[PDB]
Structure 1
């Protein structure tokens, strides 16, 4: 009343194929990594965002003036 087999399983698995892995640049979360480096990275990202806002404002002013 208890039987085990692996007969049809490979065919079933390959019907809709073995899907490949997600590219490494996606779902690239950093949670659980080394905290001392994580904190410094966060500070640098904040500075970068401020810089991007300033750059856009400068672009807008230049286009308007000339």
Structure 2
């Protein structure tokens, strides 16, 4: 016995029950894994220097406050 083949009826109603969720924000999953390697490798060396400078800045800020107290 034959039957139905295909229909898109009721599918738009189902998709909007819980809505079409908005896309993820642009700041959420932003990793350049497969990109241009020469630029990726260079950015790592800059980031390592930024982390080292961040640690040094907190050391001087803490020492200055302790001297005042």
**TM-score over 0.5 for the pair:** yes
Instruction: Say which one has the larger Rg.
Output: 2
List structure 1 runs of 4+ shifted beyond 6 angstroms: none
What is aligned with 1:42?
Answer: 44
How far 1:37 sits from its partner (Å)?
A: 0.1
What SS does the corresponding residue of 2:16 show, helix, strand or coil? helix
TM-score of the pair, normalised by structure 1? 0.96
Following superposition, the deviation at residue 2 of structure 1 comes to: 5.0
Count of residue correspondences: 66
CA RMSD after TM alignment: 0.8
Instruction: Tell me the TM-score normalised to structure 2 length.
Output: 0.92
Structure 1: stretches of 5+ with no match in the other structure: none
Counterparts of 1:30 and 1:62 in 2: how far apart (Å)?
39
